[PDB]
């Protein structure tokens, strides 16, 4: 009885701002769906975040590093704003090796094949003596939510990062008139989503669709 | 001069937007004074005082 | 810094003392977290010296109600700075403005 | 719930909760739904919701 | 660990009355209560099937604001006391109920002549009251099967608003629940009441069937 929507198109605008759309729906079950999978999107949604910072010669954040234009815990603030999507396990180590002056940025991390770095041009820090060197390797792990490091439970060195483990960004919802072959009471629901560029739209979609399926299992046999 | 400014931004005049609840996606029945204030964390935490 | 302010913000930022202020004109020779070392201008040397300023910065030190004081630079390598022009910013401090 | 000073209450509500009664209990001469009939407060919640 | 959440362990249904029912689901995800309450709530309120009175044919009124003598109700009161009358139409989707009645007495929902395909929850539910001995009142209604609330304004032919959903009224809650350790949990509490075509659970469980099959398209 009801028309069941479907996705219909996915406006990838820029690499990090999607729009997706969900066409046809029936009155009211537009907002209902936006809704619902805009708080499941911003709330629930998996990605890979730094947990885990060893900087050779470093022992706490609250320290500097000579030749390095940043302070540690400025540098552990920038790498928590480092975005990656790891494929096929849980966490990861990756490796920066730096030498001479210039920025220190994502790039220059070491390649990984199960880890891509969505936007390389990410500053890290930087380094203003020829001789200068930096050296660390970051722990990357994937999980959802907000999880600080103080609420988390190691050698001195090992610098706790809090892990924002959610991809999504910003959310946004437009429910507005669709075009049917015989129908005029439908309308089609655009997602707009602004995420770290290390999340598919489409699979943060049915991602967040399946989440509340699964919520709703309770609900469909109540007892 | 301030309403200039927002215009110049593609601002309402007013410095009242449309919000809506998160809770339900329902739209505020009246617009909402939505801008930037200046907020600053005082020398009272709780932390010292519980 | 606070997008909306009244222009007192430098002036209080610089007086307090909290920030960095280049002595001399000159070029950033040198910078880092901890250190900035600028290579004054020739027109403000004085006849016998090398034109060599050192700014040593104060990192992470407890106030005197257990705040943290820490001095980080706002000037990049090579960047060249005037007489009165803030080297490093202060607590509180955005670029030489006062950010509370 | 009576001050003992005066006898009247004391939890009176006010600021927020009293702006929220006020402007749910206020009218409005156009308002949307105007001169519907009907069979208790339960329709009107579902008819404002 | 990433793509599994927390089921409701605890699903507690407490039946106030026939048509009232009292739901509480512990524990949720964090900000899960909220979702789950206003879709349920939003689909119960305006999509949820049903069947309810559309139009009556009165004879000797030509309009709402009219008179009838006999009558004790007003026009208007009959027309209200309709919108009340919860229907049970299973054979057709558009059915007519003669409604026949003389003499001194409440004329209820009982008195509505009997139709094979069709139900009447509450069989004691007032349509008016006659004052007169020879009182007499004659009324075709027409109900039809439709989704949620259509007002009468949206659409002699009086016309009365469409209550097609069964719910009467639903509410939600979200409390403060915790497992072990994690306090910030959701409790979901959901007051609900039918007009008794349909209990309030199942009608909770058609919501929540019609959600999950619009999602179809996009569960893995």
Same mark, same amino acid.
């Given at each position: 009885?009801?028309?069941?929507?479907?996705?219909?198109?996915?406006?990838?605008?820029?690499?990090?701002?999607?729009?997706?759309?969900?066409?046809?729906?029936?009155?009211?079950?537009?907002?209902?769906?936006?809704?619902?999978?805009?708080?499941?999107?911003?709330?629930?949604?998996?990605?890979?975040?730094?947990?885990?910072?060893?900087?050779?010669?470093?022992?706490?954040?609250?320290?500097?590093?000579?030749?390095?234009?940043?302070?540690?815990?400025?540098?552990?603030?920038?790498?928590?704003?480092?975005?990656? $999507?790891?494929?096929?396990?849980?966490? #990861? @180590?990756?490796?920066?090796?730096?030498?001479? *002056?210039? +920025?220190?940025? !994502?790039?220059?991390?070491?390649?990984?094949?199960?880890?891509?770095?969505?936007?390389?041009?990410?500053?890290?820090?930087?380094?203003?003596?020829?001789?200068?060197?930096?050296?660390?390797?970051?722990?990357?792990?994937?999980?959802?939510?907000?999880?600080?490091?103080?609420?988390?439970?190691?050698?001195?060195?090992?610098?706790?990062?809090?892990?924002?483990?959610?991809?999504?960004?910003?959310?946004?919802?437009?429910?507005?008139?669709?075009?049917?072959?015989? $129908?005029?009471?439908?309308?089609?629901? #655009? @997602?707009?989503?602004?995420?770290?560029?290390? *999340?598919? +739209?489409?699979? !943060?979609?049915?991602?967040?669709?399946?989440?509340?399926?699964?919520?709703?299992?309770?609900?469909?046999?109540?007892? | 001069?301030?309403?200039?400014?927002?215009?110049?931004?593609?601002?309402?005049?007013?410095?009242?937007?449309?919000?809506?609840?998160?809770?339900?996606?329902?739209?505020?029945?009246?617009?909402?004074?939505?801008?930037?204030?200046?907020?600053?964390?005082?020398?009272?935490?709780?932390?010292?005082?519980? | 810094?606070?997008?909306?302010?009244?222009?007192?913000?430098?002036?209080?930022?610089?007086?307090?003392?909290?920030?960095?202020?280049?002595?001399?004109?000159?070029?950033?020779?040198?910078?880092?977290?901890?250190?900035?070392?600028?290579?004054?201008?020739?027109?403000?040397?004085?006849?016998?010296?090398?034109?060599?300023?050192?700014?040593?910065?104060?990192?992470?030190?407890?106030?005197?109600?257990?705040?943290?004081?820490?001095?980080?630079?706002?000037?990049?390598?090579?960047?060249?700075?005037?007489?009165?022009?803030?080297?490093?910013?202060?607590?509180?401090?955005?670029?030489?403005?006062?950010?509370? | 719930?009576?001050?003992?000073?005066?006898?009247?209450?004391?939890?009176?509500?006010?600021?927020?909760?009293?702006?929220?009664?006020?402007?749910?209990?206020?009218?409005?001469?156009?308002?949307?739904?105007?001169?519907?009939?009907?069979?208790?407060?339960?329709?009107?919640?579902?008819?404002?919701?």
């Amino acid at each position: 009885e009801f028309l069941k929507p479907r996705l219909v198109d996915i406006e990838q605008v820029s690499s990090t701002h999607a729009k997706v759309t969900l066409e046809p729906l029936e009155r009211g079950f537009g907002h209902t769906l936006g809704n619902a999978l805009r708080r499941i999107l911003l709330s629930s949604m998996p990605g890979c975040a730094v947990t885990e910072v060893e900087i050779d010669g470093v022992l706490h954040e609250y320290s500097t590093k000579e030749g390095v234009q940043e302070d540690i815990l400025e540098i552990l603030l920038n790498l928590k704003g480092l975005a990656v $999507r790891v494929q096929g396990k849980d966490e #990861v @180590i990756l490796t920066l090796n730096k030498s001479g *002056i210039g +920025p220190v940025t !994502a790039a220059d991390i070491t390649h990984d094949g199960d880890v891509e770095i969505v936007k390389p041009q990410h500053v890290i820090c930087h380094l203003t003596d020829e001789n200068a060197s930096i050296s660390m390797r970051i722990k990357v792990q994937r999980g959802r939510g907000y999880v600080p490091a103080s609420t988390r439970i190691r050698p001195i060195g090992r610098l706790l990062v809090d892990a924002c483990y959610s991809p999504v960004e910003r959310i946004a919802y437009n429910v507005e008139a669709a075009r049917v072959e015989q $129908r005029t009471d439908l309308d089609k629901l #655009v @997602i707009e989503m602004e995420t770290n560029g290390t *999340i598919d +739209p489409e699979e !943060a979609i049915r991602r967040a669709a399946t989440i509340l399926a699964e919520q709703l299992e309770a609900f469909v046999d109540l007892r | 001069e301030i309403k200039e400014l927002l215009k110049l931004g593609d601002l309402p005049t007013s410095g009242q937007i449309r919000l809506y609840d998160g809770r339900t996606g329902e739209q505020f029945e009246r617009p909402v004074t939505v801008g930037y204030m200046y907020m600053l964390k005082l020398n009272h935490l709780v932390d010292d005082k519980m | 810094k606070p997008l909306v302010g009244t222009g007192m913000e430098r002036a209080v930022a610089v007086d307090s003392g909290v920030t960095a202020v280049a002595k001399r004109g000159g070029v950033v020779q040198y910078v880092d977290a901890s250190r900035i070392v600028i290579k004054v201008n020739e027109d403000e040397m004085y006849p016998g010296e090398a034109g060599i300023d050192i700014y040593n910065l104060t990192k992470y030190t407890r106030s005197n109600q257990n705040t943290c004081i820490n001095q980080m630079p706002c000037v990049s390598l090579g960047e060249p700075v005037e007489r009165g022009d803030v080297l490093a910013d202060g607590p509180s401090t955005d670029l030489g403005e006062l950010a509370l | 719930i009576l001050s003992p000073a005066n006898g009247e209450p004391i939890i009176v509500p006010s600021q927020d909760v009293v702006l929220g009664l006020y402007y749910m209990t206020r009218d409005c001469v156009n308002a949307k739904g105007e001169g519907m009939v009907l069979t208790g407060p339960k329709e009107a919640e579902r008819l404002y919701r």
